[PDB]
Design a protein around this ligand. Sequence first.
Ligand code: CLA
Ligand code: CLA
Ligand code: CLA
Ligand code: CLA
Ligand code: CLA
Ligand code: CLA
Ligand SMILES: CC1=C(/C=C/C(C)=C/C=C/C(C)=C/C=C/C=C(C)/C=C/C=C(C)/C=C/C2=C(C)CCCC2(C)C)C(C)(C)CCC1
Ligand SMILES: CC1=C(/C=C/C(C)=C\C=C\C(C)=C\C=C\C=C(C)\C=C\C=C(C)\C=C\C2=C(C)CCCC2(C)C)C(C)(C)CCC1
Ligand SMILES: CC1=C(C/C=C(\C)CCC[C@H](C)CCC[C@H](C)CCCC(C)C)C(=O)c2ccccc2C1=O
Ligand code: SF4
Ligand code: SF4
Lengths: 31, 740, 60, 80, 134, 139, 154, 43
Amino acid sequence: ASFLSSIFVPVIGWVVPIATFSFLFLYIERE
Amino acid sequence: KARVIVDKDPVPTSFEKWAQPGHFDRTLARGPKTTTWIWNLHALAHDFDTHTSDLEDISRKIFAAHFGHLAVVTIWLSGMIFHGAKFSNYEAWLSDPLNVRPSAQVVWPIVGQDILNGDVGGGFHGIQITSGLFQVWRGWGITNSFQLYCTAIGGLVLAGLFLFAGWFHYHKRAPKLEWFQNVESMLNHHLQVLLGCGSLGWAGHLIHVSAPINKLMDAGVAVKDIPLPHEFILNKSLLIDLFPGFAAGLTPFFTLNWGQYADFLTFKGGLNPVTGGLWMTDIAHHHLAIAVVFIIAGHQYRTNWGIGHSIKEILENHKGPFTGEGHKGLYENLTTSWHAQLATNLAFLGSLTIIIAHHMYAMPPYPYLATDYATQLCIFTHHIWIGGFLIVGGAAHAAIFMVRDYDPVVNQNNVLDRVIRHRDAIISHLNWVCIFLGFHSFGLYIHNDTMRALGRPQDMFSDTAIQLQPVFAQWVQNLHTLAPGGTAPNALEPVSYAFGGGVLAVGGKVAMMPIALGTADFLIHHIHAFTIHVTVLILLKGVLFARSSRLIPDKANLGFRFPCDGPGRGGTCQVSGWDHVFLGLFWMYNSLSIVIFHFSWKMQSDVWGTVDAAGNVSHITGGNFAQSAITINGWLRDFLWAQASQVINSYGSALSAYGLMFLGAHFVWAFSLMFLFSGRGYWQELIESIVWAHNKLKVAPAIQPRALSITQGRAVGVAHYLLGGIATTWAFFHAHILSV
Amino acid sequence: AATTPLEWSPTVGIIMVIANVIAITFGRQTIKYPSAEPALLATTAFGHILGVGLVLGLHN
Amino acid sequence: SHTVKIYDTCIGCTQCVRACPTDVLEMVPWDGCKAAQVASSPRTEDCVGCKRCETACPTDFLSIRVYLGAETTRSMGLAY
Amino acid sequence: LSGKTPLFAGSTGGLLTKAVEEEKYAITWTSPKAQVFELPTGGAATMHEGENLLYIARKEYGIALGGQLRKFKITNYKIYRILPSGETTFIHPADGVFPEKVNAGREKVRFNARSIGENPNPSQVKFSGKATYD
Amino acid sequence: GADLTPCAENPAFQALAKNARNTTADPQSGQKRFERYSQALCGPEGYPHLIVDGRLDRAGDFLIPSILFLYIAGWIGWVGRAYLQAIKKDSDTEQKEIQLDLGIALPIIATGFAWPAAAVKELLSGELTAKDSEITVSP
Amino acid sequence: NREVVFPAGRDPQWGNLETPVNASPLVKWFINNLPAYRPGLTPFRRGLEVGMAHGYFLFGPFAKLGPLRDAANANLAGLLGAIGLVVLFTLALSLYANSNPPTALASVTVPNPPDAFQSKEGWNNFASAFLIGGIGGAVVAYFLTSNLALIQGL
Amino acid sequence: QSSYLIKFISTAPVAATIWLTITAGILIEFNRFFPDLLFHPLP
Ligand code: CLA
Ligand code: CLA
Ligand code: CLA
Ligand code: CLA
Ligand code: CLA
Ligand code: CLA
Ligand SMILES: CC1=C(/C=C/C(C)=C/C=C/C(C)=C/C=C/C=C(C)/C=C/C=C(C)/C=C/C2=C(C)CCCC2(C)C)C(C)(C)CCC1
Ligand SMILES: CC1=C(/C=C/C(C)=C\C=C\C(C)=C\C=C\C=C(C)\C=C\C=C(C)\C=C\C2=C(C)CCCC2(C)C)C(C)(C)CCC1
Ligand SMILES: CC1=C(C/C=C(\C)CCC[C@H](C)CCC[C@H](C)CCCC(C)C)C(=O)c2ccccc2C1=O
Ligand code: SF4
Ligand code: SF4
């Protein structure tokens, strides 16, 4: 099942940073 | 109104003030309650402005202090030629300048250090020299030791005269403030006499002594067969045989028939094929043209005969629409503050010294200098460094003028006041430029360094790949190669073979060849521009913000040298104009260090190397610069790791001292990091515990010991950081090039 | 090939002469502080440069 | 924000008030028989915390300290 | 609030966006002469013979200026705090007497009757919500 | 003794002795060096090794140098301690520290050859140590 | 001739300075009539014109210099790579919009209040238009460059 | 006066330079006659 690396690697490099930094930036800037 | 005004016997000459220290200042004159008094004694010895406020007392110290400094330089210069007289191989070096290496230092047969006196050549055991004094004396037409022995005693005699002068002036005959303030007289004298007549005189020596003698020496005559200089003057038959223009005499000069002197006042502009070096006749025609220009130029100013310019009128009348009052008030600042004059003189003198180093390597002006790669490399590296230090000193005294001597009344809507009133825009854009260059100068290395590791050499910024060529410089190169004919028609050969043209070969060596500019030079030239802009940002910021900042409104009151102005407002650490100079020195060292590295690898890879009869030039490093200097690992591999083999393996040979100074230099660099990273607070608490042990055993010092001051700890570090740094590449440059 | 030089000729001296005269007329009006004692010695010197500049400059 | 606390070792030299950049400290009358003046810190909100008050105090150890705390625009020296 | 502006061409060093949004400051002074004085943020400026007024971004600029004014023998300098809504408050010489000189109306604040050695340890005061400097 | 042989009989030592590279101006400095080093112990590499065990068979290595140091070093400390104490009774103490009173110092430097006797005398009864209660300390 | 540089407005107290680059006739028109400051437009139309300019700009670097530039699918990589960058640019607007962005500033070149970017709605509508116009500009640049030989071949 | 000159010599640097040069010259001169001295040769 080598295709999983093609799906799980970029999720760690792109999806996880975007989602985490997106929520955090709104959380730290909340009022 | 130029006049000689003097005060008779202001200051006595007693030995009293020698004993009691701190006489110059009142705070230190009280007593040494603390060890910081010791460090403050040296830091305030030359701060004459702090000792007194009367400009007469300041200027008299400065004018006399210069004389004591000249004695040190004359003793040095006289000392160099003295070693050439007694302990040297110069007399043997002239017999064969291509097989005998130059040496003038001999270390005594004491513990293990006779090794340094290896077989340098010519039956002499001595340390090999890289200053190039041997080539200078040949340019001076010195062919025997007794001639050099006479010149050394003359310098020592001259040293006493300068030394007598500073005594005579500060103590017996002190000029008044008016004597120094007559600027218009000073500038005429230095341009005409010190530079003009000094240049005109040296033309006489070159024409009468150096050019004829060197013209016999390169021919192939023995050193003993050469007549002495006075023999040429008295016996004109010998002079006419070489340069027949002298047969006409001095009449062609006065009658404007100057073409008769074409034999020894040439404009060939190329290098002598026999001895790697410019033609003596071309150098002879140099200073004669320079002297006339300088003699004429110095008559510009008035100097008390109604004829000439007032510098105040020149500056005031250069106003404009954009600049409010133009250069009004600058003459007053420069005539009421020594630091302003010091800043201008230091900055442009340093840029001059860098400008020398670039001219000399491409246009070797001495005989057999180009073939001696060791002398050529250290000579370029030397003046490159000295110019860097002096430029940083210019920014320091520029800022010291602001805190100490700035008058807002004078600088009102002038060119300087208008500069301070938009300082934010100057730095914010320079900030943008520094970031832009650092990305697009260094990021291109990382892209190459990253791609080659990924097995993608096609995606690099290299000569086969995307290459960014320096088209602008290559265009300017071709204009110089074509200056023979057309523009500059009388010139036979270009000003330098670095721009282009044919190769020159002396013996088996190559003196100079065309320096091709490719993608590697395009990157490194931007790296230099990057590193130069940042130190300007650090230094220029200190000058503008020394008076005040948005953070600190009153920064001048604290002074030029204050550590922090408190820990609040976040943190105000290193906010002074002093600390900017401290930071700029690291960047000066960073920028300047790549320049000499750019010089070493390029000249070894592209320029220098053995040459065959068929013109095949076997370069030293084998042309590896183009495909390896584009990556950072290439420098680490091909330049540092590879060329340092001679240094580490120098043990058990004559170059062993370089391996020691090389290794020792890394220590002082790391020892610097004690003071830069740490802080005074920890060290005072450590001394507290140590003082307890002395109070226990009753070895307590009367002078209470304290840790070093804050600005001192920063000063002590950068002194080590630079000394340990420069000494490292100093030995690497020496041991590597001396072996090859 | 060296530039062609100049044998002595009386025509050369008239260029030096006229060069001095234009200098005297040029300085006498425009010099801010003409008299201090002088300027005659100075203005004649400039004419020698302009003369030597014209004299050698013409014949090339 | 930055708390400025004064202790009983004051002697009314007034050197702390003259050093304050932001005019945080103000001398006040000591009702007791010590002196006609002892320091105070009414406008503590403008304390940037440059410790100039402490450097000017002539005691063995300080009669006035500056205990740092929460930051604000006035304390951080921000003109923006 | 009244006065005349010091005559200077302008400068980047000066007022920024903070003034519109929150707490710009001002300083007022009166001088008999018209000298040249260095501004708090770079530059030089002249001063009129009556009721000079300058707007400054912070309180530190004013007292730093006031110290420079004392060199010219000017001791009547008043600093204000102008809020975005126009509310102005007279601050620096809060009473007619300056801070360095004593006035009877004032009261001591944040005074500890003990010496620094007498302060409690932090372990004696933890989780209570009080600090050692109290 | 550990992984070594006598220096006189070791082959590697004799190999280096032929090419000794005399240090001083004396021509035989190299041969004279290796002659004296034959007494010491040498390893496989050919260089000598010193044993600081304290055995009297090999005491010139460290033990004799050790005694010669401490007599010299205690001279410096006893002199400095006495010169500092004598100054403290005088009025201007700090200046005398910088500008040395050679009249006071050279008599002290003349002494110090008998520093161990004075050290024991101060230790048995005297001023070698001040009391802990009368010395500055942090809280 | 007389001075060219003046203080921002009548007040010299303020920071900004009137300069040729800041307050010339030509520069004031261009900047104030750019879509980010042009009068008489809604927040949606501003973002559309801005994105349409940027998608057309961002297609080039990916195509002619990115990987596979020397391949058949070079121009296709520029379109997909640009859209991925436009989406991140679109996402950034939504975060700056949904974080209560303070205000837009008024300088000398744009003396009036710039636009109705003073709320979350103005920035959110700007973001939706950026993606629509942004993807459009890249798609346009792809079809031209890919079919530029045909357009010249006509 | 000579009294002032003696005080100059008695200062910290000149006293240190004079003394250290003497201690240096002893080790320097002793090492040229007695070359190596790795250890004390024991009879
Ligand atoms: C850790 C995770 C990760 C992953 C999986 C990738 C993956 C990739 N990077 Mg990358 N990168 C990363 C982290 C990562 N990166 C980080 C942290 C950095 C900072 C240094 C970079 C910096 C970087 C640069 C500078 C470049 C890449 C490029 C690439 C691509 C090269 C593929 C190829 O063979 O040539 C290309 C082969 C092709 C067939 C064309 C690729 C077409 C793209 C990938 C299609 C993308 C569609 C897009 C997501 C559409 C979304 C729309 C939707 C949201 C509506 C590949 C997709 C290169 C590139 O140009 O990609 C375009 C490139 O130049 N990356
Ligand atoms: C003075 C300038 C000028 C120029 C350079 C042209 C040029 C042209 N005209 Mg034209 N025209 C002009 C003035 C001009 N006209 C005036 C003043 C009038 C009024 C009388 C006309 C009336 C006119 C008519 C009635 C027609 C033309 C047509 C044409 C094209 C015919 C070329 C051909 O041989 O067949 C065709 C060759 C080709 C290679 C195909 C051309 C494809 C077009 C030109 C591509 C245009 C794309 C365009 C730039 C998109 C615009 C958007 C952009 C602004 C962002 C040619 C491009 C003919 C046409 O149909 O063009 C399509 C046509 O029917 N013109
Ligand atoms: C002839 C003997 C003589 C005597 C007795 C004096 C006596 C005096 N001079 Mg004087 N002077 C002399 C010669 C002499 N000078 C000469 C030849 C010059 C010209 C250079 C001067 C220039 C001069 C100036 C400009 C000033 C004095 C001052 C003074 C007074 C204070 C000096 C002092 O205490 O510092 C004693 C300091 C030293 C002994 C150290 C001097 C170090 C020398 C000059 C340089 C050594 C460089 C060296 C090679 C660096 C190596 C570094 C490295 C190896 C470690 C004192 C009355 C000062 C004064 O009046 O104060 C108000 C003052 O401002 N003098
Ligand atoms: C023409 C050259 C020149 C001159 C005349 C001056 C003169 C002056 N400078 Mg200055 N400066 C210069 C160049 C110059 N500088 C350069 C090139 C730099 C950049 C590095 C500086 C950086 C600088 C700073 C940062 C400061 C000055 C200051 C001063 C003033 C007081 C300095 C003092 O007390 O001296 C005595 C200085 C010392 C005792 C320091 C000793 C440093 C040693 C020599 C470093 C060791 C180098 C050595 C070669 C190492 C090898 C040998 C060693 C291992 C034994 C004085 C007016 C100070 C000041 O307050 O001005 C108002 C000040 O703060 N300057
Ligand atoms: C190697 C060490 C190092 C580096 C990299 C820097 C970097 C910098 N210093 Mg510096 N500095 C250093 C050591 C260093 N310093 C030391 C030791 C000192 C003490 C003397 C100083 C003192 C100092 C001063 C006093 C000043 C600087 C300034 C600067 C900046 C210049 C602007 C520039 O080049 O653009 C930025 C360039 C870089 C950061 C180079 C590398 C960037 C690569 C190519 C890009 C990265 C790829 C990719 C985006 C990574 C993404 C990863 C992802 C997963 C997150 C820059 C941030 C100046 C400044 O800020 O002016 C603007 C300034 O005034 N420094
Ligand atoms: C900072 C310097 C720098 C530069 C110039 C480049 C350049 C490049 N890299 Mg690279 N890279 C760098 C640092 C750099 N790299 C670093 C530090 C790393 C390590 C992480 C890498 C790692 C890396 C990888 C792994 C890859 C590249 C690739 C590439 C290429 C494709 C670029 C691309 O698709 O971006 C697209 C860029 C954009 C969409 C933005 C462009 C911005 C434009 C130019 C702005 C212009 C402003 C304008 C002039 C001003 C307007 C004025 C107005 C008033 C009108 C290109 C040659 C790829 C390749 O294959 O190389 C051939 C690739 O796969 N890079
Ligand atoms: C001279 C000058 C200049 C220059 C300019 C430039 C350089 C320009 C830019 C350019 C650009 C930057 C361009 C761009 C453009 C773009 C376009 C042209 C776009 C397009 C679009 C479209 C058409 C789209 C559409 C669509 C949509 C929206 C959706 C759906 C799809 C479609 C496709 C339909 C400047 C100003 C700087 C300065 C001054 C002067
Ligand atoms: C005009 C203007 C300006 C300026 C500007 C400049 C001059 C510049 C900029 C610059 C910039 C701002 C730049 C940027 C760049 C970026 C880049 C360089 C990026 C790249 C990226 C990449 C390469 C990635 C890719 C991708 C994606 C996106 C997704 C998927 C995956 C991948 C990886 C494929 C200002 C601001 C003032 C204002 C407005 C106007
Ligand atoms: C080590 C260190 C110190 C302590 C360094 C000290 C105290 C240096 C001491 C230098 C010499 C050793 C002082 C004593 C010299 C003797 C008087 C000489 C004896 C005489 C014989 C040599 C002849 C600081 O004070 C400091 C301050 C700020 C930042 C970093 C640091 C820092 O790193
Ligand atoms: S910390 Fe600074 S601002 Fe606060 S009272 Fe002390 S000196 Fe004044
Ligand atoms: S002790 Fe300190 S705080 Fe008290 S009056 Fe004196 S200087 Fe001010």
